[PDB]
Design a protein around this ligand. Sequence first.
Ligand SMILES: NC(=O)C1=CN([C@@H]2O[C@H](COP(=O)(O)OP(=O)(O)OC[C@H]3O[C@@H](n4cnc5c(N)ncnc54)[C@H](OP(=O)(O)O)[C@@H]3O)[C@@H](O)[C@H]2O)C=CC1
Ligand SMILES: Nc1nc(=O)c2c([nH]1)NCC(CNc1ccc(C(=O)N[C@@H](CCC(=O)O)C(=O)O)cc1)=N2
Ligand SMILES: [Co+2]
Ligand SMILES: [Co+2]
Length: 159
Amino acid sequence: MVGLIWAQATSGVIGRGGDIPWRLPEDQAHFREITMGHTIVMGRRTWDSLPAKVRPLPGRRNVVLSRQADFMASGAEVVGSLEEALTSPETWVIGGGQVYALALPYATRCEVTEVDIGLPREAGDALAPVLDETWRGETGEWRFSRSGLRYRLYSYHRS
Ligand SMILES: NC(=O)C1=CN([C@@H]2O[C@H](COP(=O)(O)OP(=O)(O)OC[C@H]3O[C@@H](n4cnc5c(N)ncnc54)[C@H](OP(=O)(O)O)[C@@H]3O)[C@@H](O)[C@H]2O)C=CC1
Ligand SMILES: Nc1nc(=O)c2c([nH]1)NCC(CNc1ccc(C(=O)N[C@@H](CCC(=O)O)C(=O)O)cc1)=N2
Ligand SMILES: [Co+2]
Ligand SMILES: [Co+2]
């Protein structure tokens, strides 16, 4: 099982300036619940974006994809191809834009948080992958985050 998990603006933006232009504590808690105990696979830029406090993210096998053969990520495994990272029964791809796109053909689940923020797409933004016909979607209801933004969770799946 390979799943992707991400939060996006309605426009599809997931990242800007190497970070994320919002933070929803309820969404991060959901992220922790879904990924805890499992493999998480991330691009090197997303590793760099993790707060030092949660590098590596606890209770998870942290795997970092990089083309730098000697890149070191303390507490993580650094691999040079995505296939090396897919050995565990449940693997969660946690971004960013490049690695979501690379992982999508392997994926059967996407856990998507849509954030009700009006953020037009800009050059250099990281974007959510596009989910075609093969994906079946189940939406939840809109919720209010203590951060002030509304959000809702989509669970997409395919065989
Ligand atoms: N909203 C959300 O839910 C999330 C948002 N984000 C945001 O996304 C942005 C980062 O996404 P992005 O810029 O797309 O970068 P990624 O996080 O996708 O990492 C890109 C890097 O991964 C490595 N990589 C990519 N493809 C390959 C490959 N085929 N083989 C080997 N290594 C590879 C390279 O590392 P190297 O350069 O070391 O070779 C490349 O520079 C940040 O803004 C981050 O905050 C991230 C995760 C979730
Ligand atoms: N749905 C989703 N939202 C995100 O914000 C998100 C995502 N997916 N995938 C990757 C990603 C990259 N950034 C980050 C940043 C911080 C933490 C973090 O601190 N996580 C703690 C949260 C614990 C909690 O809040 O209860 C963890 O232990 O997972 C995780 C991912 N962020
Ligand atoms: Co689990
Ligand atoms: Co269903």
